[PDB]
Structure 1
């Protein structure tokens, strides 16, 4: 316990002094103790935009740089909204193209909260009005903060951070309001910065308005360094000094290059296009006569470019046994692309879904590229490195790739689809080769996603001369923040990521797999160790494919009664069933080439039922030609599963499906011509289409099958009677 002479020692430690430095040295040291609390980043940015820090004495209107101010600008309202005059006040900041910070010096900045609070308010007003208004900030993130503040239950944040004009605004805050009232948003950001910096009021700003506290805390931790580097991006000499340091560091690996390495890098840049005479001379037989007479614009297996290439090959010289030659000649005209092979395989370059020596040439060239990419990044010439990428949305998803951008003006982002995008985009896995940039270049018209990669100390890469860099294979990326920016009046998406090893991301996916298996055995009544859901995921949009499985299976659960679910899933558990929710290509998850007969008979589409092993696939990025979302794709494949299980309940030694019986082919020729065009190809697709549309979300699509095919409705409701 403390005795009394110890209290004498504490109170003399606060009271007694030994050295007095006069006036002006303490005047100088009080000002630096004032400016020590501010992050150094905004001082460096105020240094870079052309600002001067003037610690003066006496009056502040008597300084030279504030001489030409009018009578009107000398009426200043402080942090609390009350009146002041500039010959009475002590800090003013000059606006425009040459800003000036003027601070009256005194010994009252060391202990007081008020004067230091007003100084940090003026510094925050500089930050909101000058630095951030050169990269078009504040923006939609801070508008979400503002609408969270003014739609609260309690009315203390509105009193603390808003003026009277922002109170009486009856609706919410749109981006029009940030356009034509940007100075009010600047005042609000300044006031939040002021209450966050001064360490007496930090707990008060946490208590009265917590969301502004979270915003400013995450801002002063990460976004201020990111914004300083993006402000240096607007300047050219910083770009070329970063260019200089990267070229000097990566000089010796470009000095240790051979001709074969440069040829491999250039063949990794562009696809090796196929030539046409080597295609035509390859046949020379009856095969030329099968290529010569053919319905070009009738078969639905090849794309537009591929049918045009075959139309180009007719001038270089049918749903029957000729189209197998089309399946075989689909892979024959595809360019030698390393990126497409790495993008489609998902790490298994031994997947035998293409030709033999082409697979071997792929594998040897990929091992050559990975063996040449051996140089680490860990160096002493630089601090944190910010490497960019412009990427298309269609490389991640085709479900949101069309409705991301609004239809009225194509320079906006639709906010509902943006929140659907933002909801579960937590991480990323880079299997293919990220050809990244050193500095910023503007994007192509299809590419609104503007990545920004922060590296690792163990990043392995190689250098190119034209202003690019390439990353290696199997890199883990954990997403930090996804926000809408504006650049040159075109609204975009900015995405940050942070490099992690692959084992953490696959550990997360293993944990999520075990959790979804426990939950959907618990909801279906199945054995403890059954593996019914699995994830073979390796691509960039991994997290949303992991998270969207829950919505897919719940929507399949809600659209069908529970008895058919239980019975057909019991059949699938008996037949080694899975529900592969993957985002890699369909012939490469190894539930499908372990039962097919030919390589060119492989299938790539939305959902797929493997008849021998009783599996249901799904594809992540790709969107169906018919479907509206993936949940109808899962019901669409559960249709084929019900077809197989009904084919087993006619005879346990006979045909696999109930639609191959001739007791449904008559109904398929009677009522198979009143519904959508996808099922019209043959009987099984109409079967799955009827089973998809009978269990719709809204009941009117269920009632269309009631009105158009009533006997098929009665037959399908007799096919549920198999229990």
Structure 2
């Protein structure tokens, strides 16, 4: 746990790749050389072993020895760290660059008194790591680039002079990743100097004196973020890739060896959904329903995305202008709920583990349950084994299952292989913890991925964390896992650019609580700033998915802006109305049809809805999804306001005839406004007054004045009406 590693494990990596060849008195010669090589992180030494590279500690002219006499006068003038030109058979260290990694260092009595030589040695090692190893997993990259740039553009123009070459300094603009591609032979060069300085004790201080973050890179990279590379290296070698697999395969070679043909079938089913057969729908449709089905232009519906309709259409053909009808719509509304592929994992994602949620029929809600509790039981054997310590399992993901919003800009419009930097930062932003409430299907050895898949996880399991082994090298995890984003950086892999995410599994508790603890704080604040009972429940968090960390920190800004854009007077009045009926501000990431605040109030189920946000009079609560995008609505906040408008439309009306409560927009005066200008604002607004008012509103109180004007320019009377109830409510 401490000594057990570096000193006694080193000696092992010492005997294998560390080769000596002196002349006489075979003694202390191996000391300075063993001491010298000790100061370096043993883990880089193992990687050198990986790409297959031996080390030679000899005497005299190093070039006068076996492995290095091939290269001719072609390569004979090697430059040193500093830039001078020390020749080979006049030097003391070199490192062969080829499909047979070789590194030769001359002997010496004691590098203690000396310090500038060990430096060079350490520098060449650098070149090694920076050119023979990392070059095989696609580093240095964007993370290390970011540190080179900070170095060129800053206060002190001296730290540059310390690492930067006789040409990295001059380069006009910042170093673009594309640049790492054309001047690479130079970049690696630098990452090396930085290693040596950091490695060579006394020269370490100088680095922490004129090297801003350049030091902090090595500090981190050489103590904690190094393994995560030795690993990647290791996840490209064959025998090892399967070395590990069979090792795990074995640990479950008793579980997998005892499964009912109902068990395996349960696992597989989970892997691939199963769209319901035509024949079944038809027979179970009944008399008047089947008959109505015959004359219903499906394409005349708004809901029911392509996928669906183009399915319901096939029933009219096997059974053998724009305005539809609402008694007809009912039907399609019902079928929508029957033509859904039975998907276990997708079901859990929607309900967020809340499997007993009246979000679907009864006959089906109950199957998902039988199946689920059944899968949870098939998964009782924990990964934790006695054949391996940390286990890194990998998983590829589509950023859309995390944040639709950013997912629409995450890829760079012109070069689809690149990741738009800005977006990347707004994603990497408030991402500190992640929840998994469905069965995570991960791969034992990183395997490529699809297109929507640009996010590449890299999970560290808990020996506790129980899972299930799969034949194709994958593992099905237990549900309700607690992850913990430890580091997110951009990476290049196989001609492409992907987002690497590094998380550590931890009890859901650790995380489930961070959420409440926070939910608590955010209320133990927005009540003061509102004059409400400090022990009231205004804001509420409903979080159970992979992008949790953000569904909370975003709540803050959303309200933090909904405030800085409206008269605090209007707020207080309205939100007390909401508060008075147990109302709620729900920032959640489970299908909306799964929020108590909507289903405790719906007559029939096919009536429930799903969307970015929504306001319901009944519970007087604003519901806000998070992993989605409103018809082009850059910010989440916006939508939050569009819903507040509904709140306002409720209080006004209320204020009219105190008990026969009816939304303000159901006024004879408004419809006379919705009729005229009530169709010169938003494509949506064109729906119905109730919504128009909400659309109009949102704009009248947006962040972009640009949007505030148009409402007043194309929707005057409305700007009068809406801003009219305002001055009414503020007086109440």
Give me the whole-angstrom Cα distance separating, in 2, the residues matched to 1:249 and 1:226.
24
Deviation at 1:12, TM superposition (A): 32
The yes-or-no answer on 1:568 pairing with 2:570 is no
Deviation at 1:10, TM superposition (A): 34
**Count of equivalent residues:** 722
Give me the whole-angstrom Cα distance separating, in 2, the residues matched to 1:216 and 1:328.
60
Give me the whole-angstrom Cα distance separating, in 1, the residues matched to 2:305 and 2:501.
32
Deviation at 1:22, TM superposition (A): 8.5
| C-alpha contact 2:586 2:623 (8 A) present in aligned 1 | yes
Give me the whole-angstrom Cα distance separating, in 2, the residues matched to 1:493 and 1:670.
50
Q: How does 1:407-486 map to 2 (within 5 A)?
A: 407-486=413-492
Give me the whole-angstrom Cα distance separating, in 2, the residues matched to 1:75 and 1:462.
57
Equivalence for 2:552: 546
SS at match of 2:483: strand
> Any idea what the Cα deviations from partners look like across 1:53-92, whole Å, max 9, x if unmatched?
1111011121233324444643333333334233332111
The yes-or-no answer on 1:406 pairing with 2:412 is yes
TM-score under structure 2 length normalisation: 0.93
Give me the whole-angstrom Cα distance separating, in 2, the residues matched to 1:43 and 1:21.
25
Change beyond 3 A, Cα 1:668–1:4:
closer
| C-alpha contact 2:10 2:42 (8 A) present in aligned 1 | no
Deviation at 1:624, TM superposition (A): 1.6
| C-alpha contact 1:345 1:351 (8 A) present in aligned 2 | yes
Give me the whole-angstrom Cα distance separating, in 2, the residues matched to 1:282 and 1:384.
52
The yes-or-no answer on 1:681 pairing with 2:687 is yes
My pick for the range that moved more, 406-415 or 37-46, is: 37-46
Give me the whole-angstrom Cα distance separating, in 1, the residues matched to 2:382 and 2:575.
49
The yes-or-no answer on 1:488 pairing with 2:494 is yes
SS at match of 2:192: helix
Deviation at 1:614, TM superposition (A): 0.7
After superposition, the CA RMSD in angstroms is 5.5
Equivalence for 1:371: 377
SS at match of 1:482: strand
Deviation at 1:620, TM superposition (A): 1.0
Change beyond 3 A, Cα 1:689–1:476:
same
> Any idea what the Cα deviations from partners look like across 1:603-658, whole Å, max 9, x if unmatched?
11121112122100000112123533212201110110010011111011113211
My pick for the range that moved more, 634-643 or 88-97, is: 88-97
My pick for the range that moved more, 270-279 or 6-15, is: 6-15
> Any idea what the Cα deviations from partners look like across 1:505-551, whole Å, max 9, x if unmatched?
12211222122213322322222112211111000011111111122
Equivalence for 2:62: 60
Change beyond 3 A, Cα 1:423–1:20:
closer
Give me the whole-angstrom Cα distance separating, in 1, the residues matched to 2:103 and 2:191.
18
Deviation at 1:258, TM superposition (A): 1.2
Change beyond 3 A, Cα 1:179–1:15:
closer
Deviation at 1:14, TM superposition (A): 33
| Residue 192 of structure 1, aligned match among 194, 207, 225 | 194
SS at match of 1:675: coil
Deviation at 1:20, TM superposition (A): 18
Change beyond 3 A, Cα 1:62–1:15:
closer
SS at match of 1:493: strand
Deviation at 1:477, TM superposition (A): 0.4
Give me the whole-angstrom Cα distance separating, in 2, the residues matched to 1:319 and 1:351.
30
SS at match of 1:580: strand
SS at match of 2:291: helix
| C-alpha contact 1:34 1:110 (8 A) present in aligned 2 | no
SS at match of 1:439: coil
Deviation at 1:570, TM superposition (A): 2.2
> Any idea what the Cα deviations from partners look like across 1:319-364, whole Å, max 9, x if unmatched?
4122222222221121221112101001211111212232222111
SS at match of 1:103: strand
Give me the whole-angstrom Cα distance separating, in 1, the residues matched to 2:508 and 2:139.
35
Give me the whole-angstrom Cα distance separating, in 1, the residues matched to 2:64 and 2:7.
51
Give me the whole-angstrom Cα distance separating, in 2, the residues matched to 1:680 and 1:13.
78
Give me the whole-angstrom Cα distance separating, in 1, the residues matched to 2:12 and 2:254.
63
Change beyond 3 A, Cα 1:353–1:400:
same
> Any idea what the Cα deviations from partners look like across 1:292-318, whole Å, max 9, x if unmatched?
222311221211111111111111222
Give me the whole-angstrom Cα distance separating, in 2, the residues matched to 1:536 and 1:3.
44
* Structure 2 segments unaligned to the other structure (5+ residues): none
Change beyond 3 A, Cα 1:626–1:114:
closer
| C-alpha contact 2:711 2:719 (8 A) present in aligned 1 | yes
My pick for the range that moved more, 220-229 or 67-76, is: 67-76
Change beyond 3 A, Cα 1:495–1:7:
closer
> Any idea what the Cα deviations from partners look like across 1:38-58, whole Å, max 9, x if unmatched?
222222222222322111101
Equivalence for 1:711: 717
SS at match of 2:173: coil
| C-alpha contact 1:482 1:493 (8 A) present in aligned 2 | yes
Change beyond 3 A, Cα 1:719–1:461:
same
Deviation at 1:561, TM superposition (A): 2.3
Change beyond 3 A, Cα 1:444–1:594:
same
Equivalence for 2:156: 154
SS at match of 2:345: helix
Change beyond 3 A, Cα 1:653–1:98:
same
Change beyond 3 A, Cα 1:70–1:545:
same
Equivalence for 1:272: 274
| C-alpha contact 2:393 2:459 (8 A) present in aligned 1 | yes
Give me the whole-angstrom Cα distance separating, in 2, the residues matched to 1:285 and 1:3.
76
Change beyond 3 A, Cα 1:232–1:711:
same
Deviation at 1:251, TM superposition (A): 0.6
Change beyond 3 A, Cα 1:37–1:620:
same
The yes-or-no answer on 1:356 pairing with 2:358 is no
Give me the whole-angstrom Cα distance separating, in 1, the residues matched to 2:460 and 2:8.
53
Change beyond 3 A, Cα 1:626–1:298:
farther
Change beyond 3 A, Cα 1:11–1:186:
closer
Deviation at 1:11, TM superposition (A): 36
My pick for the range that moved more, 7-16 or 99-108, is: 7-16
Give me the whole-angstrom Cα distance separating, in 2, the residues matched to 1:20 and 1:229.
34
| C-alpha contact 1:299 1:319 (8 A) present in aligned 2 | no
Equivalence for 2:122: 120
My pick for the range that moved more, 42-51 or 607-616, is: 42-51
SS at match of 1:136: coil
SS at match of 2:202: coil
My pick for the range that moved more, 501-510 or 220-229, is: 220-229
Change beyond 3 A, Cα 1:9–1:497:
closer
SS at match of 2:711: helix
Deviation at 1:199, TM superposition (A): 2.7
My pick for the range that moved more, 346-355 or 83-92, is: 83-92
* Structure 1 segments unaligned to the other structure (5+ residues): none
Deviation at 1:166, TM superposition (A): 1.9
| C-alpha contact 2:434 2:485 (8 A) present in aligned 1 | yes
Change beyond 3 A, Cα 1:570–1:473:
same
Change beyond 3 A, Cα 1:486–1:522:
same
| C-alpha contact 1:33 1:110 (8 A) present in aligned 2 | no
Change beyond 3 A, Cα 1:322–1:20:
closer
Give me the whole-angstrom Cα distance separating, in 2, the residues matched to 1:163 and 1:466.
49
Deviation at 1:140, TM superposition (A): 0.6
SS at match of 1:215: helix
Give me the whole-angstrom Cα distance separating, in 2, the residues matched to 1:466 and 1:473.
20
Deviation at 1:553, TM superposition (A): 1.4
| C-alpha contact 2:19 2:54 (8 A) present in aligned 1 | no
TM-score under structure 1 length normalisation: 0.94
My pick for the range that moved more, 85-94 or 583-592, is: 85-94
Change beyond 3 A, Cα 1:55–1:137:
same
| C-alpha contact 1:377 1:458 (8 A) present in aligned 2 | yes
Change beyond 3 A, Cα 1:132–1:11:
closer
> Any idea what the Cα deviations from partners look like across 1:103-129, whole Å, max 9, x if unmatched?
110112244322222211111111111
Change beyond 3 A, Cα 1:22–1:638:
same
Give me the whole-angstrom Cα distance separating, in 2, the residues matched to 1:630 and 1:20.
69
SS at match of 2:505: strand
Give me the whole-angstrom Cα distance separating, in 2, the residues matched to 1:311 and 1:125.
64
Give me the whole-angstrom Cα distance separating, in 2, the residues matched to 1:145 and 1:2.
34
Give me the whole-angstrom Cα distance separating, in 2, the residues matched to 1:210 and 1:378.
41
| C-alpha contact 1:626 1:678 (8 A) present in aligned 2 | no
| C-alpha contact 1:27 1:107 (8 A) present in aligned 2 | yes
